[PDB]
Amino acid sequence: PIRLRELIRTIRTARTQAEEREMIQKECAAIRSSFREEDNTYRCRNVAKLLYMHMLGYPAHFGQLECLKLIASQKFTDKRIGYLGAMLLLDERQDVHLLMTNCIKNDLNHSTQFVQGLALCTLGCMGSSEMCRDLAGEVEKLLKTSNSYLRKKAALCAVHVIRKVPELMEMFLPATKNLLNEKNHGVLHTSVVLLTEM
Amino acid sequence: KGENTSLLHP
Amino acid sequence: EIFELKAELNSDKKEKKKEAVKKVIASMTVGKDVSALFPDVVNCMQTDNLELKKLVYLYLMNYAKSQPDMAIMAVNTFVKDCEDPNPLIRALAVRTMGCIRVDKITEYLCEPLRKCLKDEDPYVRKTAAVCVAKLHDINAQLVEDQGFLDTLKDLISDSNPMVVANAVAALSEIAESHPSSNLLDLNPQSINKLLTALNECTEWGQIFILDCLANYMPKDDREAQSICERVTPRLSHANSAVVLSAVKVLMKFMEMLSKDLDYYGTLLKKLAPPLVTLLSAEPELQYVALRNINLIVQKRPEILKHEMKVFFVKYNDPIYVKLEKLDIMIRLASQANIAQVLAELREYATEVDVDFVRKAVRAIGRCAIKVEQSAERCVSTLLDLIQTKVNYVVQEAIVVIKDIFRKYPNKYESVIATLCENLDSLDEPEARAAMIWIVGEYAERIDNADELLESFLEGFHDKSTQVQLQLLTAIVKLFLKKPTETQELVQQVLSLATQDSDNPDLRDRGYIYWRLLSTDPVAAKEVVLAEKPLISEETDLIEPTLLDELICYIGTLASVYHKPPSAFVE
Amino acid sequence: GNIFANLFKGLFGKKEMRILMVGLDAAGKTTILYKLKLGEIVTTIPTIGFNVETVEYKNISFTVWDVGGQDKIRPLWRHYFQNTQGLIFVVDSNDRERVNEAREELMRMLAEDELRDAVLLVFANKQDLPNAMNAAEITDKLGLHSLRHRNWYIQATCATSGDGLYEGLDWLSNQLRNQK
Amino acid sequence: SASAVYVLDLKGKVLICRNYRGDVDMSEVEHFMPILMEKEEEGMLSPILAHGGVRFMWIKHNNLYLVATSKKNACVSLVFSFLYKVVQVFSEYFKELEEESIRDNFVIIYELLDELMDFGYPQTTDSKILQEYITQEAPRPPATVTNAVSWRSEGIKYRKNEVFLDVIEAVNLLVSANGNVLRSEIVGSIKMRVFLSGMPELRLGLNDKVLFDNTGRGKSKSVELEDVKFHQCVRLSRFENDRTISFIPPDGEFELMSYRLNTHVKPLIWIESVIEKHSHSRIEYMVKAKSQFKRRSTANNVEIHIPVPNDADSPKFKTTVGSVKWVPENSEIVWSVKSFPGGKEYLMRAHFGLPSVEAEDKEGKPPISVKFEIPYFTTSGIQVRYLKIIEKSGYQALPWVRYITQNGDYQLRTQ
Amino acid sequence: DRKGGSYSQAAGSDSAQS
Amino acid sequence: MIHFILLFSRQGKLRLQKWYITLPDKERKKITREIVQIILSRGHRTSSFVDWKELKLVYKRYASLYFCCAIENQDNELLTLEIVHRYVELLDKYFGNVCELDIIFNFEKAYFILDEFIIGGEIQETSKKIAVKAIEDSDMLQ
Ligand SMILES: Nc1nc2c(ncn2[C@@H]2O[C@H](COP(=O)(O)OP(=O)(O)OP(=O)(O)O)[C@@H](O)[C@H]2O)c(=O)[nH]1
Ligand SMILES: [Mg+2]
């Protein structure tokens, strides 16, 4: 399991485009070998290396099931890596985010404020036309809570759902009523943005 | 180099 | 920095002057404007060491146009160095004098050039010959006044074959820019003398010796036969440019040779192995070799008629070579190797290069159109490519089928059924228009021509001008042929192209079609659905006037681009 | 090389094994997995994605990957076919109209050249209503005996009660492990 | 007719420039990099660029592009030949062709560039001859450049007179996916390392088919070289007259002649490979190598490259003879065999996984290339007959030569 | 020894052709 | 809302990328290349605003590495610059003397900070200390 810093240094050590491509392929071969064995200990390092390779301009199609598997994991680092992979290499046209709806729903009711917040941010960033349809009920539940750190995330998720699904704005009218008295600046800004979008 | 310099120098 | 360098260069120590010169040379190469220190380096110019003299001369040459006024302090040094006993010093001084682009300096350099013109050292003679050409290029009037043409002419008829080749090259360069007045052409004796030193010239001198014969025009078969016999040994030269120059010279001389004699056949047979050897050169020269073959292919296509296996594009071949390979195969394509050409094109259609795939499709279509004996094979290959489910391949196959149908549509009714349902959802204007034209012209073997045109009429008012015109023509043809199932379709097309169509040409075409329909529908069958004459295929052969001129310009920029020399130079 | 460490690990139990959880939606797959892992009938919403869990029994870590029976998730079973050693099929005997769909889905999933070492594991879910068939009528309808080179075993498990889960686990362990 | 010969780098910086005519501004080199980038990004990149009225024709080196700007209708072939000669001279003088020597050997590099070409017309290109007048560690120029013989310096003396020859064969086969070979040509290469005293006039004699027919012995094994390219020292007139190969060998290793004739015989190595690639499940490589060469010859260092999937992972190789290793950098299975006796048959059974998610774009089917190299085996059957080493002083030479058979463009098209 | 085939001595000319 | 954010170096290499619009990978790469070419082919007095594809492409690089944004033509232009400056200040405070070297190696931290700051192209926390405290608490979780 090569570290992210070591992979970055190795990539920076390549000068020619062919040499950089060869190094990227050599790293991707080891990453794919580790992934095919169902590795769970050094999965975060492999995910980081795959994300770095994809950002540098290399294919990362094979690293799709690994992100979904890490999303439904229990480790905080693994969950964060899976969320980052879903946000970066996952989109509406990917066609592999359909199975991520169950993971998002499972993580939407998590007691931890970081896993739920990360899931909400991922849903807002990669909202699809069908994910919001099956996630609209859970978004409204979090919008009526008194969590200042979660109120902004709920408002952003509702705004993203409304933008993706203009017909779902009717379910947010009774949830945003009497929400202009928030002391926190972020909550007030989120409420104002949601009202302007509506 | 030009990379080790601070983005804002604060 | 600058002050320290100037102080070091203005010192009496050679160990510091050499270091300063090296630093100045490195700064200029590193990209530092050291032209402000040119007057300071002028004092440290007349040095006994040859290592620092070369650097000073290079700095002066590179810092001569920038500071022409400061270069007036070097004429005396050049004059003194032009008489050194060492031939290397004299050659360096001669080269530096001609490399200085100073209007007030070349005038005083005529005397050293005249002195070095008759230099006994062959290196000195070559340097003087190069300097004469440089001065003539800089100032033709000064060279003419100095009377260097007579000295240059006598250089060819003297010893030192390298010096003779250099003088010949200088004379050719001077005459190249000259207005053809007082040409340096020579009689057969001069040609024989040049050929005698051709076998003793170096690799670079061979090009200079063979370029002179490119301008001479033989007048008799005996002279042409001798020239061909003397140029024949040049085909076995390791230098790629030497072989190309020899081939060009042989091609030029073949314009006066007689095909009745066996010399023409021997020359043709001895030229194919040279082309085969040149085809296996470096990738950089591969494009030049392909261009030369294409230029000579349209002139003497009977030499490389059997050379088809060597024209196959390799897996590691470059894009510029792979593209030229398809053109070479198309030019040399015939019924003898039609199967081989089809197999090569089929393999070239499975690659990943979109441009390469398009070029292969175009070559296959050109081969099918040129040779009617392989029309069925080309149609089958196009159908297989379309069935391959490739968007670019599908568009290329549609274009090829549309082109073939207009040229050979007599027995093209067996492919309309397959093309009736061939993924018509493609939005390529070059493919949709071709499919519409094929359906309109071939609306006899398809029983659902009206139904197929319905999908293309949804956005006929905003699809395209050419696409809209093709759709209107197909609708008119269908109405003229079968007006029972397209009676309402014709009216709808006329309403959409005449009322909601703002295109001037499209509106005029729609109005004309409506007038023809409302005036005499029976006459529209003989007017619109008439038998068009044979379509004149675009010949790829160049004009004979350009081919004759392009024959003399072989291996130059005018041959690779296939353009006249005056249409690309500035 | 030396295999002393492997022998020491195997002296107290080293094999873990794997398992799959596929079948039609509302077939008791999620409830069966909850009973196997926890031991209670937990009510859950339909599996839009998938559920991954593990079961520790007989010194073997029986990892269960629940897969929903949704139409949009039916063709997604090929994602779990990579690096998979076991497969459990959950039938729905209470849905006569869905029995044909479940059989077709099982046949489609069983007609893959990559999933060959995964033995058949037929679980009779919803074994609490009188309309549920026996352990042979369902197998006869599904044609489990016609699966060449497939080791299938039909077991009836009650979601509400949990009877037969131990027998199914023992059968899976015996099929996976071929030692004493 | 180059206007300014310059050497670029991988970042667009001109390592060294040397104008020869001055008709092209030195600032045109800056636009060469954007033009090359635009051509590469649109598929129109070519070795000869065009910046308005100035054409930038150059080749690609190991680390820098030796682009030579020109403005008139200069000979592109001449420019390419000059660039090749400059590259050869740099390789002879500097063991490495990279930016490490461009910025460290400028003192001698500038002198070599100035002496090589004057006014755009090269005059001296022999590395051995040029090394006697331009050194990095100056006397009068040698008489060899002025004399006709510019490839053999006079006065060379050695303790012994031994010349080592190298008859290197290049077996190139273009086998299509259908199983037939389209381009099957063998190009000979007679490279000799002449080390003698004086200026001997070598008289090379082989069992050429044309020579045998002319002498009347056109019935034994004769090499039918379709194209023969002699070196500069080889006299073209002598070869044209009566097939007499008479030339003065140079001091060092050089290529005397380069034969090139077609081959109509069966390939030395026959590769029967199959692809049982499952649809996103697995892949099988039933590759079998059959040696059609003579059993007395061994193909040392046999490397049959099998292109495996680019995204394949967890691969397994079930072969019989030779180590099989998959290199992710090359994305192919290297069937490396140390010793391959003639007539041997090696069978391999590849097995690698594949991701469930399909690839976004196609990757193509690169051809399978073998790297067989069987020494002491001449496929063309050409054998050296005599080598007339004649010296005015008179000495007993000890010529030597070896025959090496290798694989050139021996690629096999995939299915 | 040497990889690629041992070097062999060459003749001087075609002794059988005079 | 910001359509996309691309942190590219002066040499053209991109150290960060965050697009809020679902676009194809080839299309996204082409758009990034075009944005890099436009920014790299612009002077220092271009107003730091480019109308590319009807998008207020605002470029404001405080070091060798440049910054880009894609703001729709419905809000003020100075808001994007203020948001970029606030994000840069927050990243510097979280990291401590943030340079180009720490951006490449600590790309995950920058991505997490961006996710915790802006979600869906809109602002999530107006303050600069609350976001830093939340990021520190999330990192300390393990
Ligand atoms: N009361 C009762 N219901 C059962 C029994 N067996 C199966 N079910 C039904 O089967 C469903 C099981 O759903 P889950 O446990 O959440 O998971 P699942 O079987 O994969 O169903 P999906 O999530 O929709 O794919 C329940 O909703 C029940 O209605 C049983 O023994 N008793
Ligand atoms: Mg379930």
Global Rg of chain E: 26 Å
Structural class of chain E: alpha+beta
The helix/strand class of chain B is little secondary structure
**The CATH topology of the domain at 4-131 in chain E is what?**
Beta-Lactamase
Number of helical runs of chain E?
A: 8
PDB class: viral protein/protein transport
Keywords: nef, HIV, trafficking
Entry title: AP-1, Arf1, Nef lattice on MHC-I lipopeptide incorporated narrow membrane tubes, centered on beta-Arf1
Chain A: AP-1 complex subunit gamma-1
Describe the structure.
It is classed as viral protein/protein transport. The structure is cut from a larger assembly and holds seven protein chains of seven kinds. Chain A has 198 residues and is an all-alpha fold. Helices cover 66% and strands 0% of the residues of chain A. Chain A contains ten helices and no strands. Chain D has helices spanning 4-11, 29-37, 96-110, 137-142, 165-176; strands spanning 22-23, 50-57, 60-67, 89-92, 122-125, 154-156. In chain D, the strands form two sheets. Chain D has a four-stranded parallel β-sheet with strand order 1-4-5-6, with helices on both faces. A two-stranded antiparallel sheet of chain D has the order 2-3. Chain F has no helices and one strand. Chain F has one strand at residues 8-9. The termini of chain F are far apart. Chains in contact: A-D, A-E, A-G, B-G, C-E, D-E, E-F. Strand 24 of chain E pairs antiparallel with strand 1 of chain F, so a sheet runs across the interface. The complex binds guanosine-5'-triphosphate and magnesium ion. Residues 29-30, 47, 51, 66, 68 of chain D line the site of magnesium ion.
In short:
With 10 residues, chain B is mostly loops. Chains in contact: A-D, A-E, A-G, B-G, C-E, D-E, E-F.
Sequence-ordered SSE layout with sheet pairings:
This is part of a larger assembly, with seven protein chains of seven kinds.
Chain B: no helix or strand
Chain C: H1 2-9, H2 14-30, H3 38-43, H4 50-62, H5 75-81, H6 87-99, H7 103-106, H8 110-117, H9 122-138, H10 140-146, H11 148-156, H12 161-177, H13 188-198, H14 203-212, H15 221-231, H16 240-253, H17 262-279, H18 283-297, H19 319-331, H20 338-348, H21 354-370, H22 375-387, H23 391-407, H24 416-420, H25 429-441, H26 449-456, H27 465-481, H28 487-498, H29 504-519, H30 521-527, H31 544-552, H32 557-560
Chain F: E1 8-9
The complex binds guanosine-5'-triphosphate (GTP) and magnesium ion (MG).
Magnesium ion binds at residues 29-30, 47, 51, 66, 68 of chain D.
Protein name (chain A): AP-1 complex subunit gamma-1
Organism (chain A): Mus musculus (Mouse)
Family (chain A): Belongs to the adaptor complexes large subunit family.
